[PDB]
Structure formats: C-alpha cells, structure tokens
C-alpha cells in the first residue's frame, strides 16, 4: 500500500491525478475497486482497462462468477482476484444516470467500500456513467469510513474537484 503523491482531503480520504491501473502496479493495493457493471462485461472505460492490464484473466474469472451466481444488484459488489494489480478486485456497479438508474444508488455503491480497510479507487458513477463528480467526490467523503485513495485519470478535473472540496 505504498500510495504517493496523494492529497489528503480528510482524515480517510486522499485524491491524484493518475491513471488507477498505472497506480495498482506501483502501489500494489490490498484492494483495487472496478467501476463495473452487473454482468460483470469489462468492455470500456476503467473496467476495460483493468482487464486489460490482467490479460483479460479478470473477465475470464468475471464470467465463470455470473454463471454461477448471477448478476449483480445497482448498488452492490462482489470481491474476486486482484490478479497482477492488487491482492482483491472489489467490483463494485454505481448507478448509471445515463442509463436512467437512480443516483441515489450511489450511497449504496460507496457503503461496499467500507468492508475492506484500505482502497485504490475510481470516482464513482463519473464518466460516462453520467454523475456529477463534484456530487460523487461528496458521497465518497460522507460515506466512506475506511480509507480510500481516489486515483482520477484527468488534471482538468482533479483540479476542479479540489477546488470544489476546498470552497
Ligand atoms: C488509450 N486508451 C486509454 O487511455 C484506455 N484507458 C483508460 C484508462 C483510465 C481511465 C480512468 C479514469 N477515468 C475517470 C472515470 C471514473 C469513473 C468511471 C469512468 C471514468 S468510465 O469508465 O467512463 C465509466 C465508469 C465510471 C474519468 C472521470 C477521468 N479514472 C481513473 N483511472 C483511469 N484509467 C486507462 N487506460
């Protein structure tokens, strides 16, 4: 968990301006999150590029679990390898406004976080998934109680987002 470069926004919060998958292979995380979806099909955005870096190993992995246990639940997680960049992914599906799913969702998305302590993740539901960032980074701070490191792929929008903490 050795995480570098981080400004801390509280005392369970920090924040860079960074590629997460560049991040799991420095830092090599106890827990990565993915930005997932309910099936658990990795086909773009951070979720593409986890898998990616694993080799496709993740999707592979990803597959044998929905065959045997379904999907996943807006809102929910499952806990499977972390592969080559963590020692656990904890895939976690925040809603997609986008895709007409209710933000209020993404409460539930954060509270998975709090069952592992100490994360590398991605800022919830932002991209195209569609959510406010500002509103993401606020219900990360109320809801997370375990510690996370926030890794935003964008310098455009990590300043905005410390900006918008820091009012
Ligand atoms: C040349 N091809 C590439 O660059 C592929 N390639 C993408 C990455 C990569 C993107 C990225 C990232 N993006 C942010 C983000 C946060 C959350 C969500 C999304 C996007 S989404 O995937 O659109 C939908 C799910 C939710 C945005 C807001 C800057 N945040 C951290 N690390 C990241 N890594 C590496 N590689």
């Known amino acids: 968990n050795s995480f570098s470069g981080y400004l801390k926004l509280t005392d369970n919060v920090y924040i860079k301006n960074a590629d997460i998958v560049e ?60 592969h080559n960049l963590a020692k656990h992914c904890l895939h976690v599906v925040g809603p997609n406004v986008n895709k007409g799913e209710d933000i209020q969702l993404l409460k539930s998305a954060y509270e998975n976080f709090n069952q592992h302590e100490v994360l590398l993740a991605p800022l919830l539901s932002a991209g195209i998934f569609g959510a406010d960032p500002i509103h993401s980074l606020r219900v990360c701070v109320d809801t997370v109680r375990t510690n996370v490191y926030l890794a935003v792929f964008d310098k455009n929008l990590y300043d905005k987002l410390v900006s918008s903490f820091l009012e």
């Open 23 to 82: 991040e799991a292979k420095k830092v090599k995380p106890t827990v990565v999150v993915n930005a997932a979806n309910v099936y658990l099909k990795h086909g773009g955005g951070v979720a593409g590029a986890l898998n990616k870096a694993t080799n496709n190993a993740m999707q592979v992995e990803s597959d044998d679990y929905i065959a045997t246990n379904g999907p996943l639940k807006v809102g929910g997680s499952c806990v499977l390898s972390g």
